[PDB]
Amino acid sequence: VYSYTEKKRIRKDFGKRPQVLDVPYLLSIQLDSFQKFIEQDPEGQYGLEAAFRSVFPIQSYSGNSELQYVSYRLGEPVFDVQECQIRGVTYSAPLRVKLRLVIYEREAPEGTVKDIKEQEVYMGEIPLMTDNGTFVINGTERVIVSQLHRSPGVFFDSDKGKTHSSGKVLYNARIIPYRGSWLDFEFDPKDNLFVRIDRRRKLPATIILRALNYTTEQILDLFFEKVIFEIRDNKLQMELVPERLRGETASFDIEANGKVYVEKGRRITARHIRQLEKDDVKLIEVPVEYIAGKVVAKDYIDESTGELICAANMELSLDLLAKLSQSGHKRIETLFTNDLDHGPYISETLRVDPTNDRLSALVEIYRMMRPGEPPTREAAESLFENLFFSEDRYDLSAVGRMKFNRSLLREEIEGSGILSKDDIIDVMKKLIDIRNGKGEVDDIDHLGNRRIRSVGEMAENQFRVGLVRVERAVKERLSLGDLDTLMPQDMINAKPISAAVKEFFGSSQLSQFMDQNNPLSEITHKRRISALGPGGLTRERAGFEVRDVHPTHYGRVCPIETPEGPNIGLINSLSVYAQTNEYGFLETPYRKVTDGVVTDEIHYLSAIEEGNYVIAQANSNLDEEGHFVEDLVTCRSKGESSLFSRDQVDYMDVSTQQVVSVGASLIPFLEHDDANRALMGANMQRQAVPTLRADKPLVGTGMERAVAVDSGVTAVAKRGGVVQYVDASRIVIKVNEDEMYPGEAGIDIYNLTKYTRSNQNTCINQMPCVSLGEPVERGDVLADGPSTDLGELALGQNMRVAFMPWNGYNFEDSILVSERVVQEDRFTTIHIQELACVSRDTKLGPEEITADIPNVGEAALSKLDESGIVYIGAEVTGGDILVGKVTPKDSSLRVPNGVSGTVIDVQVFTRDGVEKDKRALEIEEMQLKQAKKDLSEELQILEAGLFSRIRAVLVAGGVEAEKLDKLPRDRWLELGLTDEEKQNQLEQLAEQYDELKHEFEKKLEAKRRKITQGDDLAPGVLKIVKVYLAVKRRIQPGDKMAGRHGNKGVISKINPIEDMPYDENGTPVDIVLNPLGVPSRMNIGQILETHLGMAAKGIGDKINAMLKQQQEVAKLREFIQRAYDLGADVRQKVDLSTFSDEEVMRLAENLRKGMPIATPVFDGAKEAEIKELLKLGDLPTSGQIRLYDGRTGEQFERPVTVGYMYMLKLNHLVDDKMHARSTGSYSLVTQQPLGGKAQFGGQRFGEMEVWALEAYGAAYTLQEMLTVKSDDVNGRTKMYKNIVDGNHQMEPGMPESFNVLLKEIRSLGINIELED
Amino acid sequence: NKRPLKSLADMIKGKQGRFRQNLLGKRVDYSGRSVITVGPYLRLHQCGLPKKMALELFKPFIYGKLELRGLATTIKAAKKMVEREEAVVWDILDEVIREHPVLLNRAPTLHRLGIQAFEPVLIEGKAIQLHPLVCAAYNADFDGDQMAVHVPLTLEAQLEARALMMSTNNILSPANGEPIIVPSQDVVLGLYYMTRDCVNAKGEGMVLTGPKEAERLYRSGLASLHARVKVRITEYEKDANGELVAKTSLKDTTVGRAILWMIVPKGLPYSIVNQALGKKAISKMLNTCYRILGLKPTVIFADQIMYTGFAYAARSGASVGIDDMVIPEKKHEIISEAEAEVAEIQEQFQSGLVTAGERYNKVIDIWAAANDRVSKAMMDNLQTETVINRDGQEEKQVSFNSIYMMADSGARGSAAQIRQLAGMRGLMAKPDGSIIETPITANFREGLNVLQYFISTHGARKGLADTALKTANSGYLTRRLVDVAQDLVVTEDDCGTHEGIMMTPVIEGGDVKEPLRDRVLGRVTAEDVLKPGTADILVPRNTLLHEQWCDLLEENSVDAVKVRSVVSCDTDFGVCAHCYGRDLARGHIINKGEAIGVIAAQSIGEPGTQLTMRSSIQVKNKG
RNA sequence: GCAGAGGUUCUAGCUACACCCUCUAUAAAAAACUAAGGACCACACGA
DNA sequence: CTCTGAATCTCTTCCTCGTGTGGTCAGGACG
DNA sequence: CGTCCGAAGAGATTCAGAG
C-alpha cells in the first residue's frame, strides 16, 4: 500500500538492505525536551516542578514565616505565533503560579499555623516553542541549539607528555559538578598527591582529609594497608602474609618454621608463594636492618607516662626501634610500601603538609580561598559546609551521580547530590590505583562522558538561577517582614526571573539566530549539537582533541556535517537516528542479534555500553532469517573494525544511514565522494536559497520527503479526509467520518503562509499541492513550502550538466550557465527585505510622517500616498523614497542604492496616545476587514460542516428530507427525532453550537481590540513603519552556485543558448562544469549523480515521448513497471496493477519532467544498476555522449559526460557583495571607511597588504592609501578638491590615527612627542 | 554583559589595539569588493570590472572630467548626474579608465604578488573578472572568492602601480626565479592534449609545409589534432650577437605540436614544444622564454598560449566519467592475497609465535605491499592497457584516458589523488596518528563501507583541523618574519667584501637534492671560481651568476662556489646590491633601495599553509 | 567671493567640502540651485 | 652559607579579510 | 528645572645541593 500523495509521484528507491526502523521525528530532540520542561510533572522530576521544588523553603530567621509552592499552570499565550512575529513581541505564556503562605506562632515550631493564604501569583514570563520547535524572541524566529558539554562526574585525566618536561606521566582527577566548584586532585612531579580546587593554587591534598574530620591514623588506615609487627624473644618475630610477597625482591633470607624458602639474591617466584601457602606460613623472621626502611602507621605512647614516644608517618631508625622495644609496644603497625605498584603517595604529602588538626586545615583552606583577611573557625567551617556539604551552593545532577558511581565502580545508581567523605576517599583511592597501574584513565572526547544539554535543561537551569536570585531577596525581606501585614505577592516579582529568562533566550552564547532559508537548514540547525556555550569549552580554549572526531561518534554525532573555519568539529550535527538519553547522553538504535538471528527489536545503546557488546555493520547481508550469509562479518567491538563470526555478534546497525545526519544524508552517492567534499556539500546544502518554482531532484536519497514532512515548512494534514476547497492562501480539509471525534470535530482548515520575510531575507511561500476532491490521509503533505515539491525537499533545481572545459569560462572551479537557465527562471529567487522606519522623540518638537518633504521632486513623491507612505504594490527602484519623514528644524526612509523590487505590504505600528495618520487608519481598517472576512469564512465553513454532520445523522430514525428544506437552517431543535442516543448527540451539538455562538462575538471583539490597541514599542518613539520589499534576484555572473557533492563555483558568463554544446538530438546543455575538479577534490559522487540523473531524464524523455503521442495506458504501465523493477532486487517493489489505471496517467504526467530516483547514503545505486538504467532508455550504457560545439558546430572528440545533476544556488549572491566606495562618513579614529557593510565602507587594507606594498617598491601608493585616502582630514579634503580639479597631487599631512595613538599613550602617563 | 571593559592599555596592544587595527593596516577609501570571474578573453595586463564599481570608485575623477568638459557647472550637479547614471556619464567614465590601474587585492595577501595592478576593462555585471593566469599567483579560486579593488589616485601612485604592480611586471615570484603566471590547471590540460600523438590517427604521415598548414588541416577536420606528421618550420635562434638566425628543417612531430609553433616567439627553439608539455614542461618553457626573449615577448607568448590552451581544451572535450577510471583486474587477487596473509599472521599470533607488536608490524607491512601492488596494477591499467593499431597488427601506446591525461600532465592531481579513485585508498590513520590495522580497501569508483567512510572522515577531520591550526600558525610566523625584517633594504651597490659562504650542493645521504646550478643562480660570487685547471678565472670575482654562467658551471663540472652572502655584508642599516644578488622577480641585479626583508619574510611565510605538522654504507654509482 | 547682510524661490542661504551678483554699514532688476553626524560584544556564514 | 641549576609561577599571544543577524552603566527622586 | 548620589614558550622568582 502507498499513500495517495506518494501515488502522485512515487520515488524509485534503491538499496538492497531492508529498513527495520522508520526514521524518527527529526525535531524530537527539541520538542520532546521542551515538553519535559513545561509539562506539569507530578513526580516533581525534570521540569519547572523540580525547579520550583528545589527552591521553595522560604524559612524566615526567627520569624516563623514559611511560603511553599503548591501548583502552577502556564497561561494561554497573549499573542499567537504569527501575531507575535509581526508585532515583534515574544511568543510567551504567562506563568500563573499558585502559592501558599502560612505563618506559625512565635516559639511554637511544632504548632499549627494561624492563617492560610492561597493565591495565584504571576511570576516570570516563559517563552514557548512553536510546532516547529523554535522560539520567537523579538519578531525573530530564534532556536536554541543543544549543547554537548562534559557531563558532571569524576574524570581521571593524564596530561601525558609535556608536563615536567621529562617524560614522567602525571595523573589528575576532577570532581566536575553540574553546579558548584571543581575539585582537582593532581600529582606533584615528585609523586605527591596535591589538591587544586577551582583551579586555585596547588595545595597538599591530605589537608582535605583533615578538613573532613580525619586524623593521620585514620588517613593511613584508609589509604594504606596496615602490617602488624610483634616483638618476640627471637628478635621481633615478623608477621608476613603470602599475598604481600608477590612481585617483591630478595629483601632478606626467608626462613620460617625451621625451613628455608627464599635465600639472598633470589626472586620470589609464584611457585615459592604456592609452596609457602601450602606450608601456610604466617610469621617470618626478618633482619633488624629491614625495619629501618618501614614507616610507622599509628601513634604509640608508653603505658607508664603516656608521652609521645613516636608519632605517626615517619621513618624508623635504630633509636626509634630501641625506644619502642624498651617501652613494650608489642604490636607495631607499619605501612605496606611497594615501589613497583603500591607506592607511597599520601605519606609524602603528609611530610609536605604542615597541618595536623581539622581547624588548621580549615584555616588554610580559607586562606587559599579568601586571602587577605583573618579567617575564623566558625567562618571556615561555614565556608566548607556551604562549599561541599550544602545543596544550594553545590549539587550534582542525577547524571552526575550516575557518572560518579560508574567511574568509581559503585553499585547504587542514584545518590545524594552533594559529596561526602566516602566519595572523596573513593576518588583518591581510584586515583592512587590509576597511578599504581591497575585501571585505566578515561577519554574526555568519549560520548559516554559528554552529555547533551537540550533547550529544556538550559531553560530549567536559567529558571533555577532566577528562582535563587528572587529567593535571596525574599529571605532578605522576610527577615524584617511582619506577619499578616502583606499579600504573598510583594516579596516575589516577575522582573528578575523574567529578565534572566529573556536574557538567556535572546542574547546568549547559544541562543542561535535560526538560519531559516531552507527546510534542510531549519531541520539541521534545530538538531545542531554545539560544544561551545555557557559551561562549555570556547573556540580558543578548545583542544585539538575535542574538535577531532572520536570512534564512538558512530551513530550518535555525524562525522561529516561540521562547519569548517574557526569552529571545526565543535558544532557537529546529530546523526539521523540518534536520540538523547534521559540522562542527556546520546543513544543509537541497534538491532538485537539473537543466537544467529538479527532480531527486529531495536535497543537504543549509549556510548559507554556500546563497547561492551559488538556491533555488526549495516552492510552485512542477511538471508531473511536474520542469519548472516557471511560467516565472518565486519564488526565494531571496541571502536575497532574487525571481522567476527556470526555467533559472536551481539548487535547490528539499524540501517545504513545511521552515521550521517540529515544534512549529509540527502547527498546522493555519499559513499563515493570524498569526506571533505561531502562535508562541504552538506554545509552548502544548509545555505541554498529557494528557487521560485522548486522541483524534485532527479537523483536523491529518499530522506527528502522525511526532512520536508518533519520540518515545519510544509502544511502536513493532522487528520485525513478530502479537500473540500483549496486556495492559494487556504486549504480546507473535510475530515472523514471514521477519523473525526464525536464532538467538536468539524473539518480542518489550513491557512498556508503566503510570501513572508524570512530570517535570511527569503520568501517562505507555501503553495497548495492538492486539487478539489483529492482524498488526503492522515499525516500527509498538503502545501509545498519553501524549497519543497510534492512533499519532497527540493533545495535547488536540477538541470543538464556537461563535464568539459569550455574556452576557460569554467577555468578551475567556475560554473558556466546557459541563457536557457536564465530564460526559464530556474534560479530566480524572491528576497523579502525589511526596511523599517522609526519616528523617535526629538528635541524642539517631534518629527512628522506626512508627505511634506522639502527639496525633493514631485516624481519621488508620486509613489507615496497622500500621507507619505508608499502605495502597496508599487515597484520602487534603487534610491527611491518609501515613507516620508522630516525632522524638525529630510530624514525620510529611502531604498538603498542598487536594490530594487516591489512592496508587498506596509505594516504600521503606532503607540497609544498619538493620533494615527491616514495610511495607518486605512491599514487598520483593511486589517479589521480581513479579520472579519476570515472569521465569517470559518463561520460559514464550520457551520456547513456541522450541518453535514447533523444531516448525515438525521438520515435514519426520523428522517425528513422535505421538512429540512422548508424551515430555515438556523433552527433545528424543533424537529421530531427518536428519543435515543442520536437525540442526545444532537442536543450536545446544539448546546455546543449555542456556546460557540456566544463566544464568536467575544473573540471577534478581542481580535478587534488586538488590532486597535497601540503596540508596545521602545521608549521615546512615536510610530514605527515597516515596509517589506520583494526583490526578485535572477541568476547573474558571480552568483555562487554549488551542487550537493561539494562542487562550488561562481557563474562566469551567461552564455547564449546558441553557443551551448548540443548533442545529436540538438538539446543544449544547461551548465558546462569543469572535469578538473573531480579527481583532485574527490567528489566522484557528482559523476555518479550525473550519470544517474542522465538515466532518470532518459526515462522521463521516453515517458514524454510515449505521452505526447496518444498511446494506450498499457504501454505506459508496462514501461513504468519495467523502470521500477530494474534488474537487481530492491526494497522498493512497487506493482502497477494495483493502481486505478487513471492515476497511472497522473503518475506518468508527474514523471514527464524526469524519473525520480532515490540513492540511499551507503547502499545506493551500483555501477551495474546505473548501466542497466542507461540501457533501459536510448542513452548509451557508457554515460557520456558526443557533443557538438555551439560555435564551431563540429563534434568534440572524446565524447563528454552529460547528465542532469541536482545543483543548488547558494545565498551568497554577487548582488550582496558589491561594496564600491569613493568617499563617505568616517569613524571615531577618523578612519574613513567606517567598518564597511550596509554602512558605506572601504575594505580594510590590512597589515598583510601593507607588507605586500612594502615588498614592492611602493612608497607613494602605500603612503597615499595609509594617509590621504584613509584618515588625514585635511589630506582627504585636499585630495578630493585636487582630483575634482584634475591635478592628482597628494598633500601628505599626517594620519589622525597616529595623533589618537599619541593622545592615548600620553593619557597613560607616558610623554610621547615629536621633535621639530 | 559581565566582560572586562577596555582600558587605556587594551586599546594600544593586541589585534584590536590602535597599532595593528588603525596604524599598521587601516581601512581605505576608493575600495570595493565582489566575487571574481574568469573572463579568459582578458590579457593579464588588464582585468574586468563592473560598471557600478567603476562609477562608484572613480566618482571624484568623473566629477573632475564633468567640470572640465562643462557638462555640469558644479560638483553638486555632477553628483546628481552620477546618481542618474546618464549616458554621458558612462562615456566620461570610459575616459578615466583608459590608463588608470587598479590594485586587485585578495584578502589573505600572503606574499608580494597577492596585490597586483590591472587596467580595468569596463564590463556589465557585478563580478570582478580576474585573468586566469594570475589566479595561481593570487592563490585565488572561483568558488565565491572575493578580492578588493583599490584605486591609485595620484600620478605617482598610478605610475608606480603601472611600472611595478602590473601582472606584466610580475612574472617571476619573489620566492624563486620560477614563473608565477605559468599555465596552471585547464590551459595546461589543453596543451597536454594538444602535444601528444596516436600511433594511428587521421591524417598521419603526410608532410606539412608549416604550422599554417597544420592549422588548416586540423580546422578542416581531415587530419587529427595529434598525428605524427613531418612539418617544415622556420626555427629562429639568437646564437649571433643578438641577431636571430633562421634554421629550416623537417622535424618529425605531430600536428598539435606544430599548432603551438606559431604561438611561441621567434627566439624559442622547437625542442621545447616537441614533448608532451605537462605543467613542468610549460614552466620550463616560460622560464626559457623569459630568460631569452625578455619580458614583453614573454607576456605576449603567455597570453597566446593561454588562448590556445583554453580553445583546444574546449575542442578536446576532456571529460570525466566512470569508464574513465579503470579497476585493475588484479585488484581482486591482490585483495585476496592480502586477506590470506593477514589471516595467516593472525593464526600465527593466536598460537603465540608472534606477539601483538610484531603482528601489527607485519600486517601493516603486508597491507602496504598490497597497496603498492594495486597502485602499480592501476597505473598499468591506466597507461598501458590502451591497445591501438598502426594500420598493421598490434601496438601499445601511452593512454589517452581522461583521468590519466588530467593527472600525468600535472594539470590537477597527484599520485595519491589518483590512487584514491581506482586503487585501494590505503591504510587510513586514527586521530592520534596510529594506523588502522585494516585499510580502506574499497576505492571511490566503487562504494565505501560505513566503517571505511568512518575512517575516511577521521582522516578528513584531522586534515581540516590541521589546516585550520596551520593557517593561524603560518600567519603568526609570517608576522614574526616580517617584523624581524622591514628594517633591511638595499642601501648600497657594493661593499668590496671578500667574505661570503661557500655554496655547495646539499647532500643528506641520498642523491643531490638541489644542484649547485639552481642553488647559486642569481648570486654574486666572492672569489674567482676555477675549473680543474688551476689559476683559471672561469668566473670573475664580482659577476652575477645568470643562466649563462650557471650553464657554463655545469659543463665545467664545478663542485663548490664561494658566493657573497647577505650575512657577510658589512653595510650598516642595510645591505649592498651585490651581496644580495638577483631580484628573483626581474632578470637583473637587485635595485638599489628595494625592500628585501619584507620580500624574504613573505616568501618564507607564504608556504607555511602548505607545510605539515607531524648499519652499512653502500655506494650508489661508479666514482 | 573668505570678516556681514541683501536679492528674484521656499524658514534660512555669509564658500560651511559646498552654487550666482553687490558694498563696507545701504537691500533689489535676475534664470540653473541647497543640508556638512553615527561605537563594542556575541552568533552564524564565505573564502 | 651563598650561590648553581632547576622547578615553579606568571606573562603573552595563538591568521586575515569580508557578509548577514542579535545584545549592551542599568540616576531617580528631591531641593 | 537642575543636581547628587588548552598550549607553548620565555622570563622572572623562588629555591635549593654541595662543597
Ligand SMILES: [Mg+2]
Ligand atoms: Mg576558492
